Amino acid sequence: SEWKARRFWASVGIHKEEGGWAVLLDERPLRTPGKQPLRLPTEALALAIAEEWQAVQEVIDPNAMPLTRSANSAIEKVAPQFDAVAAMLGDYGGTDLLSYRADAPEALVRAQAEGWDPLIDWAATELRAPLRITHGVIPVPQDPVVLLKLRAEVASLDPFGLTALHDLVTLPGSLILGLAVIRGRIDAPTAHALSRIKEEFQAERWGRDEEAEAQAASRLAAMRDSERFWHLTR
């Protein structure tokens, strides 16, 4: 309803810049909520963000503009705090979902093994990061050298790329799943399905939980948004 939310522009285009691309609402350059200049690493993302602004009807709906939202985060929070963010994501290497297997029932333990072992194998091979796997509640600490190797893989990403990595790691609760998505080993819908092997297994055996399903659907959409953002920024 806010007057400030009303669309007043006719066309939306893009244009180069001394440092990245820009999106234009008529002749007026798009700025970040923080008044800072919005510069995008690629034309692909610029054009995609322009479609979001061309799609505005009467009033701006931020929920409908996931790319703009992530671009703002990259410029405003991730680029300036790259080191602290790469560290926080890297930390998941020591509490990775794939390293914790159920104790029971057996059919669940086998399900996890079949879906996850291949990803643990990939991480040991491609990232030279074999994780220690635990069964049950008592956490096994990871090899300090492996944690250094995984944190280093994260640190080597560009800022926009680190921003996309964020949700791919935190939502499923796994750094391996997040890196597998951006490295092209699996896509986001597969990463999502692998993370919920236990949830899916229990639902099929003991009954669906509507709230859990709603929350899972939300995580999947956010993971697909992060994946899109990663590809657009390459």
mmCIF file of C-alpha atoms in Angstrom:
data_model
loop_
_atom_site.group_PDB
_atom_site.id
_atom_site.type_symbol
_atom_site.label_atom_id
_atom_site.label_comp_id
_atom_site.label_asym_id
_atom_site.label_seq_id
_atom_site.Cartn_x
_atom_site.Cartn_y
_atom_site.Cartn_z
ATOM 1 C CA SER A 1 0.000 0.000 0.000
ATOM 2 C CA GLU A 2 3.038 2.189 0.636
ATOM 3 C CA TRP A 3 3.356 5.006 -1.922
ATOM 4 C CA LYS A 4 7.056 4.171 -2.073
ATOM 5 C CA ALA A 5 6.150 0.683 -3.301
ATOM 6 C CA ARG A 6 4.337 1.814 -6.483
ATOM 7 C CA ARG A 7 5.804 1.108 -9.937
ATOM 8 C CA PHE A 8 6.352 4.334 -11.847
ATOM 9 C CA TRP A 9 8.698 3.148 -14.577
ATOM 10 C CA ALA A 10 7.932 2.203 -18.148
ATOM 11 C CA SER A 11 10.906 0.158 -19.230
ATOM 12 C CA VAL A 12 13.785 -1.716 -17.647
ATOM 13 C CA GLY A 13 17.197 -2.210 -19.179
ATOM 14 C CA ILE A 14 20.804 -2.977 -18.279
ATOM 15 C CA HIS A 15 24.157 -1.333 -18.993
ATOM 16 C CA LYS A 16 27.868 -1.893 -18.415
ATOM 17 C CA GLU A 17 29.904 -0.033 -15.784
ATOM 18 C CA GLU A 18 33.471 0.554 -14.595
ATOM 19 C CA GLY A 19 32.761 -2.275 -12.175
ATOM 20 C CA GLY A 20 30.022 -4.672 -13.250
ATOM 21 C CA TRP A 21 26.584 -4.246 -14.808
ATOM 22 C CA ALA A 22 23.648 -2.034 -13.852
ATOM 23 C CA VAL A 23 19.849 -2.300 -14.081
ATOM 24 C CA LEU A 24 17.852 0.733 -15.150
ATOM 25 C CA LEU A 25 14.268 1.710 -14.366
ATOM 26 C CA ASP A 26 13.905 4.022 -17.374
ATOM 27 C CA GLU A 27 17.053 6.118 -16.974
ATOM 28 C CA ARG A 28 17.270 5.678 -13.219
ATOM 29 C CA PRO A 29 19.896 3.137 -11.985
ATOM 30 C CA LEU A 30 18.727 0.606 -9.416
ATOM 31 C CA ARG A 31 20.325 1.037 -6.006
ATOM 32 C CA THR A 32 20.535 -1.339 -3.056
ATOM 33 C CA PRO A 33 18.177 -0.846 -0.099
ATOM 34 C CA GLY A 34 21.239 0.679 1.536
ATOM 35 C CA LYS A 35 21.495 3.407 -1.114
ATOM 36 C CA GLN A 36 24.685 1.750 -2.353
ATOM 37 C CA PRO A 37 25.118 1.197 -6.115
ATOM 38 C CA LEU A 38 23.819 -2.138 -7.408
ATOM 39 C CA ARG A 39 26.575 -3.661 -9.570
ATOM 40 C CA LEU A 40 26.154 -7.224 -10.830
ATOM 41 C CA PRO A 41 29.105 -9.452 -11.871
ATOM 42 C CA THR A 42 27.331 -10.729 -15.000
ATOM 43 C CA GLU A 43 24.950 -9.603 -17.759
ATOM 44 C CA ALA A 44 23.059 -12.833 -17.301
ATOM 45 C CA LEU A 45 22.082 -11.823 -13.723
ATOM 46 C CA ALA A 46 21.515 -8.197 -14.745
ATOM 47 C CA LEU A 47 19.002 -9.274 -17.384
ATOM 48 C CA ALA A 48 17.357 -11.662 -14.926
ATOM 49 C CA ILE A 49 16.994 -8.968 -12.293
ATOM 50 C CA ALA A 50 15.583 -6.649 -14.994
ATOM 51 C CA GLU A 51 12.855 -9.210 -15.732
ATOM 52 C CA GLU A 52 11.862 -9.125 -12.079
ATOM 53 C CA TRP A 53 11.464 -5.356 -12.189
ATOM 54 C CA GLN A 54 9.651 -5.455 -15.548
ATOM 55 C CA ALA A 55 7.286 -7.985 -13.984
ATOM 56 C CA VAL A 56 6.167 -5.644 -11.208
ATOM 57 C CA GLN A 57 2.469 -4.907 -11.553
ATOM 58 C CA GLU A 58 1.067 -2.031 -9.522
ATOM 59 C CA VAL A 59 3.115 -2.413 -6.336
ATOM 60 C CA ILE A 60 6.556 -3.934 -5.647
ATOM 61 C CA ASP A 61 6.490 -7.343 -3.912
ATOM 62 C CA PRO A 62 9.927 -8.281 -2.591
ATOM 63 C CA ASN A 63 8.833 -11.906 -2.248
ATOM 64 C CA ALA A 64 8.559 -12.050 -6.040
ATOM 65 C CA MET A 65 12.072 -10.775 -6.512
ATOM 66 C CA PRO A 66 14.431 -13.429 -5.155
ATOM 67 C CA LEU A 67 17.333 -12.425 -7.418
ATOM 68 C CA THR A 68 17.202 -8.802 -6.352
ATOM 69 C CA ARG A 69 17.077 -9.913 -2.726
ATOM 70 C CA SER A 70 20.177 -12.114 -3.096
ATOM 71 C CA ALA A 71 22.038 -9.443 -5.062
ATOM 72 C CA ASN A 72 21.400 -6.975 -2.237
ATOM 73 C CA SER A 73 22.692 -9.522 0.296
ATOM 74 C CA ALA A 74 25.857 -10.123 -1.741
ATOM 75 C CA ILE A 75 26.681 -6.418 -2.037
ATOM 76 C CA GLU A 76 25.611 -5.431 1.446
ATOM 77 C CA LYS A 77 26.373 -8.387 3.734
ATOM 78 C CA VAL A 78 28.392 -11.124 2.038
ATOM 79 C CA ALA A 79 31.030 -9.128 0.109
ATOM 80 C CA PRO A 80 31.896 -6.949 3.162
ATOM 81 C CA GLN A 81 31.944 -9.926 5.536
ATOM 82 C CA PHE A 82 33.237 -12.572 3.162
ATOM 83 C CA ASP A 83 35.726 -13.958 5.702
ATOM 84 C CA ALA A 84 33.183 -14.350 8.516
ATOM 85 C CA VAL A 85 30.603 -15.858 6.150
ATOM 86 C CA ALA A 86 32.965 -18.305 4.461
ATOM 87 C CA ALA A 87 33.997 -19.342 7.987
ATOM 88 C CA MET A 88 30.458 -19.868 9.205
ATOM 89 C CA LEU A 89 29.618 -21.986 6.171
ATOM 90 C CA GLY A 90 32.915 -23.853 6.381
ATOM 91 C CA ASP A 91 32.014 -24.749 9.975
ATOM 92 C CA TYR A 92 29.359 -27.103 8.657
ATOM 93 C CA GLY A 93 32.130 -29.436 7.626
ATOM 94 C CA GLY A 94 32.365 -30.429 11.281
ATOM 95 C CA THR A 95 28.611 -30.953 11.792
ATOM 96 C CA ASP A 96 27.633 -32.168 8.341
ATOM 97 C CA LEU A 97 24.289 -33.983 7.967
ATOM 98 C CA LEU A 98 25.856 -36.681 5.843
ATOM 99 C CA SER A 99 28.261 -37.684 8.594
ATOM 100 C CA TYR A 100 25.502 -38.616 11.069
ATOM 101 C CA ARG A 101 23.675 -41.911 10.493
ATOM 102 C CA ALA A 102 20.635 -43.219 12.391
ATOM 103 C CA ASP A 103 20.922 -46.151 14.805
ATOM 104 C CA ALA A 104 17.555 -47.570 13.705
ATOM 105 C CA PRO A 105 15.571 -49.073 12.282
ATOM 106 C CA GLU A 106 17.822 -50.955 9.871
ATOM 107 C CA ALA A 107 15.764 -50.003 6.802
ATOM 108 C CA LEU A 108 16.509 -46.341 7.657
ATOM 109 C CA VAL A 109 20.231 -46.921 8.089
ATOM 110 C CA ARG A 110 20.409 -48.579 4.670
ATOM 111 C CA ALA A 111 18.457 -45.743 3.019
ATOM 112 C CA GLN A 112 20.923 -43.152 4.288
ATOM 113 C CA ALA A 113 23.891 -45.273 3.259
ATOM 114 C CA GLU A 114 22.595 -45.685 -0.296
ATOM 115 C CA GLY A 115 21.886 -42.010 -0.843
ATOM 116 C CA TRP A 116 24.788 -40.482 1.119
ATOM 117 C CA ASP A 117 27.782 -42.781 0.751
ATOM 118 C CA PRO A 118 28.182 -41.703 -2.902
ATOM 119 C CA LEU A 119 28.417 -38.061 -1.805
ATOM 120 C CA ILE A 120 30.882 -38.867 0.960
ATOM 121 C CA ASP A 121 32.877 -40.760 -1.727
ATOM 122 C CA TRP A 122 32.714 -37.735 -4.036
ATOM 123 C CA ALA A 123 33.962 -35.415 -1.309
ATOM 124 C CA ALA A 124 36.825 -37.732 -0.429
ATOM 125 C CA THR A 125 37.754 -37.901 -4.135
ATOM 126 C CA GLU A 126 37.029 -34.465 -5.655
ATOM 127 C CA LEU A 127 37.643 -32.258 -2.629
ATOM 128 C CA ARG A 128 40.129 -34.613 -0.950
ATOM 129 C CA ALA A 129 37.900 -34.337 2.101
ATOM 130 C CA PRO A 130 36.929 -37.723 3.495
ATOM 131 C CA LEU A 131 34.552 -37.190 6.439
ATOM 132 C CA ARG A 132 34.364 -39.454 9.519
ATOM 133 C CA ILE A 133 30.916 -41.008 9.730
ATOM 134 C CA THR A 134 29.146 -41.600 13.008
ATOM 135 C CA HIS A 135 26.179 -43.793 13.804
ATOM 136 C CA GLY A 136 24.012 -42.451 16.564
ATOM 137 C CA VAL A 137 24.051 -39.511 18.884
ATOM 138 C CA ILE A 138 27.701 -39.386 20.034
ATOM 139 C CA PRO A 139 29.467 -37.039 17.521
ATOM 140 C CA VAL A 140 32.848 -38.108 16.164
ATOM 141 C CA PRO A 141 35.194 -35.166 15.644
ATOM 142 C CA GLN A 142 36.520 -34.669 12.111
ATOM 143 C CA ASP A 143 40.160 -34.857 11.059
ATOM 144 C CA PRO A 144 41.497 -31.298 11.571
ATOM 145 C CA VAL A 145 43.139 -31.474 8.092
ATOM 146 C CA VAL A 146 39.824 -32.256 6.451
ATOM 147 C CA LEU A 147 38.197 -29.229 8.110
ATOM 148 C CA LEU A 148 40.990 -27.075 6.749
ATOM 149 C CA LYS A 149 40.512 -28.529 3.287
ATOM 150 C CA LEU A 150 36.762 -27.861 3.253
ATOM 151 C CA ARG A 151 37.022 -24.348 4.687
ATOM 152 C CA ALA A 152 39.557 -23.664 1.912
ATOM 153 C CA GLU A 153 37.123 -24.776 -0.791
ATOM 154 C CA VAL A 154 34.604 -22.246 0.489
ATOM 155 C CA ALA A 155 37.125 -19.427 0.801
ATOM 156 C CA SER A 156 38.019 -19.770 -2.876
ATOM 157 C CA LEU A 157 34.601 -18.578 -4.044
ATOM 158 C CA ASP A 158 33.687 -15.172 -5.462
ATOM 159 C CA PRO A 159 31.298 -13.091 -3.265
ATOM 160 C CA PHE A 160 28.157 -13.597 -5.295
ATOM 161 C CA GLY A 161 29.021 -17.279 -5.445
ATOM 162 C CA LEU A 162 29.456 -17.434 -1.674
ATOM 163 C CA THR A 163 26.006 -15.829 -1.292
ATOM 164 C CA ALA A 164 24.418 -18.549 -3.435
ATOM 165 C CA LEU A 165 26.302 -21.207 -1.490
ATOM 166 C CA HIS A 166 24.792 -19.931 1.780
ATOM 167 C CA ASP A 167 21.316 -21.466 1.673
ATOM 168 C CA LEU A 168 22.486 -24.569 -0.194
ATOM 169 C CA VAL A 169 24.496 -25.317 2.954
ATOM 170 C CA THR A 170 22.409 -24.061 5.855
ATOM 171 C CA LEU A 171 18.972 -25.280 4.724
ATOM 172 C CA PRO A 172 19.874 -28.994 4.254
ATOM 173 C CA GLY A 173 22.475 -28.661 7.034
ATOM 174 C CA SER A 174 25.398 -29.947 4.973
ATOM 175 C CA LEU A 175 28.493 -28.407 3.446
ATOM 176 C CA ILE A 176 29.050 -31.400 1.208
ATOM 177 C CA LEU A 177 25.547 -31.113 -0.231
ATOM 178 C CA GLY A 178 26.021 -27.387 -0.770
ATOM 179 C CA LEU A 179 29.379 -27.801 -2.524
ATOM 180 C CA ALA A 180 28.061 -30.724 -4.598
ATOM 181 C CA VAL A 181 25.328 -28.425 -5.994
ATOM 182 C CA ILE A 182 27.648 -25.621 -7.034
ATOM 183 C CA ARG A 183 30.317 -28.007 -8.349
ATOM 184 C CA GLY A 184 27.708 -29.684 -10.517
ATOM 185 C CA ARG A 185 27.686 -33.145 -8.864
ATOM 186 C CA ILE A 186 23.973 -32.931 -8.061
ATOM 187 C CA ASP A 187 21.326 -30.282 -8.597
ATOM 188 C CA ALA A 188 19.327 -28.542 -5.824
ATOM 189 C CA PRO A 189 16.222 -30.687 -6.003
ATOM 190 C CA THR A 190 18.437 -33.788 -5.552
ATOM 191 C CA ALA A 191 20.333 -32.179 -2.649
ATOM 192 C CA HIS A 192 16.965 -31.485 -1.047
ATOM 193 C CA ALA A 193 15.737 -35.073 -1.501
ATOM 194 C CA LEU A 194 18.997 -36.484 -0.151
ATOM 195 C CA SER A 195 18.755 -34.338 2.937
ATOM 196 C CA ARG A 196 15.314 -35.619 3.786
ATOM 197 C CA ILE A 197 15.926 -39.369 3.475
ATOM 198 C CA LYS A 198 15.132 -39.779 7.165
ATOM 199 C CA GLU A 199 12.124 -37.428 7.095
ATOM 200 C CA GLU A 200 10.745 -39.152 3.996
ATOM 201 C CA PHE A 201 11.429 -42.597 5.428
ATOM 202 C CA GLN A 202 9.567 -41.825 8.679
ATOM 203 C CA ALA A 203 6.662 -40.213 6.802
ATOM 204 C CA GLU A 204 6.174 -43.274 4.616
ATOM 205 C CA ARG A 205 6.246 -45.592 7.642
ATOM 206 C CA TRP A 206 4.478 -43.650 10.340
ATOM 207 C CA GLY A 207 2.477 -40.927 8.607
ATOM 208 C CA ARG A 208 2.985 -37.547 6.904
ATOM 209 C CA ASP A 209 3.434 -34.429 9.043
ATOM 210 C CA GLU A 210 1.764 -31.434 7.327
ATOM 211 C CA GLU A 211 3.871 -28.803 9.052
ATOM 212 C CA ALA A 212 7.096 -30.652 8.232
ATOM 213 C CA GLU A 213 6.011 -30.965 4.602
ATOM 214 C CA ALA A 214 5.229 -27.230 4.447
ATOM 215 C CA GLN A 215 8.681 -26.445 5.889
ATOM 216 C CA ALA A 216 10.348 -28.883 3.448
ATOM 217 C CA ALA A 217 8.563 -27.249 0.491
ATOM 218 C CA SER A 218 9.877 -23.864 1.658
ATOM 219 C CA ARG A 219 13.462 -25.133 1.978
ATOM 220 C CA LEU A 220 13.266 -26.669 -1.523
ATOM 221 C CA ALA A 221 12.081 -23.366 -3.107
ATOM 222 C CA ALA A 222 14.832 -21.414 -1.341
ATOM 223 C CA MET A 223 17.431 -23.972 -2.464
ATOM 224 C CA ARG A 224 16.215 -23.657 -6.052
ATOM 225 C CA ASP A 225 16.530 -19.828 -5.718
ATOM 226 C CA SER A 226 20.145 -20.158 -4.520
ATOM 227 C CA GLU A 227 20.990 -22.537 -7.324
ATOM 228 C CA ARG A 228 19.549 -20.148 -9.932
ATOM 229 C CA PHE A 229 21.564 -17.316 -8.408
ATOM 230 C CA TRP A 230 24.747 -19.387 -8.580
ATOM 231 C CA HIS A 231 24.297 -20.246 -12.266
ATOM 232 C CA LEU A 232 23.328 -16.695 -13.231
ATOM 233 C CA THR A 233 26.475 -15.360 -11.627
ATOM 234 C CA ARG A 234 28.908 -17.594 -13.483
#
